[PDB]
């Protein structure tokens, strides 16, 4: 029942510990690329990220308490959002650019609609000076929240997820109080951060829609879930 017995500092510690590595792409600066090969690079990258995401998800406090079927559903719903918020986070210190990988930094000249929204989100995080401890909270929230309203008297599973969710909220507030924010500022910043999640959901949905407008076996199945 461990998830619900963790302090805020232990929660942050566990989430930072669970963080996936930053993977490299197969981008070659000397090689010429078509729109097909660029999507190929990103598909290859995203597909490899998913494997790490799955193992990261299992280290998110409370996630393994869920049934297997519920774990699948949450990841199916949130995988693109989680990839996006990860991209946006590591792109903060590169204004006007998205750092898909340390060897893959792109501007809007090189989907452009989603790109723009991802840049805006990155700019938004930068202006707020988003902390890493806040980012990992947000990402865990996305994993647990995005599919919670689209699942048989199971409803206890929903209840457990919401309790963990409330905990991450406690953790967020804890972090802002630690940073010396007034009580008013904490509530405001909390709201600001969570409102951004609505945008990330928007970006995910529009991303899928433009796609249906080559993929790996895992991605195809993930894609299946949003149709």
């Amino acid at each position: 029942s461990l998830a619900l017995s963790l302090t805020a500092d232990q929660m942050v510690s566990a989430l930072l510990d669970a963080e996936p590595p930053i993977l490299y792409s197969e981008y070659d600066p000397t090689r010429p690329f078509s729109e097909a090969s660029m999507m190929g690079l990103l598909t290859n990258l995203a597909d490899r990220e998913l494997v790490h995401m799955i193992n990261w998800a299992k280290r998110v406090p409370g996630f393994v308490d869920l049934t297997l079927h519920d774990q699948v559903h949450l990841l199916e719903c949130a995988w693109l959002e989680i990839l996006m918020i990860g991209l946006v986070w590591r792109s903060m210190e590169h204004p006007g650019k998205l750092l898909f990988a340390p060897n893959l930094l792109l501007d809007r000249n090189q989907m452009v609609e989603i790109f723009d929204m991802l840049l805006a989100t990155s700019s938004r995080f930068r202006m707020m000076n988003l902390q890493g401890e806040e980012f990992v909270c947000l990402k865990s929230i996305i994993l647990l929240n995005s599919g919670v309203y689209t699942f048989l008297k199971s409803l206890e599973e929903k209840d457990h997820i919401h309790r963990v969710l409330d905990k991450i909220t406690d953790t967020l507030i804890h972090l802002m109080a630690k940073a010396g924010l007034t009580l008013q500022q904490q509530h405001q910043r909390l709201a600001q951060l969570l409102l951004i999640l609505s945008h990330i959901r928007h970006m995910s949905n529009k991303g899928m829609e433009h796609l249906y407008s080559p993929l790996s076996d895992l991605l195809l199945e993930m894609l299946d879930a949003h149709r």
């Binding site: 494997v51 799955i54 297997l68 699948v72 076996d217 895992l218 199945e221």
Partner: peptide
């Protein structure tokens, strides 16, 4: 599903 498998490892 592949997601299903990788989860229960």
């Amino acid at each position: 599903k592949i997601l299903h498998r990788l989860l229960q490892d």
